[PDB]
């Protein structure tokens, strides 16, 4: 995943990095057992 590779591998930092790299987003929080990278 995009940093979110599960409960024991929840790198929301990298999820944020990912989403920040996407235009129209400013960040990205890691959700759903640390599996879903959700950009905002």
From Swiss-Prot:
Compartmental location: Secreted; Host cell membrane
Domain of life: Eukaryota
SS bond list: 4-30, 15-37, 19-39
Binding locations of beta-D-GlcNAc-(1->4)-Mur2Ac(oyl-L-Ala-gamma-D-Glu-L-Lys-D-Ala-D-Ala)-di-trans,octa-cis-undecaprenyl diphosphate: 2-4, 12, 18, 29, 31, 33, 37-38
Chain intervals for the UniProt region annotation (Binds to membrane interface): 6-9, 31-37
Effect of residue 31 to G: No change of antibacterial activity
Note: In mice infected by S.pneumoniae, it has an efficacy comparable to vancomycin in the peritoneal model and to penicillin in the pneumonia model.
Job description of the protein: Antimicrobial peptide that potently acts against several species of Gram-positive bacteria. It selectively inhibits peptidoglycan biosynthesis through complex formation with the cell wall precursor lipid II (1:1 molar ratio) thus inhibiting cell wall synthesis. It does not disrupt cell membranes. Is especially active against numerous clinical isolates of S.pneumoniae, including all 90 different serotypes and isolates resistant to clinically used antibiotics. In vitro, shows considerable selectivity for bacteria over mammalian cells.
Family label: Belongs to the invertebrate defensin family. Type 2 subfamily.
Protein name: Fungal defensin plectasin
Upper taxonomic lineage: Eukaryota, Fungi, Dikarya, Ascomycota, Pezizomycotina
Encoding gene per record: DEF
Residue span relative to the full protein: 56 to 95 of 95
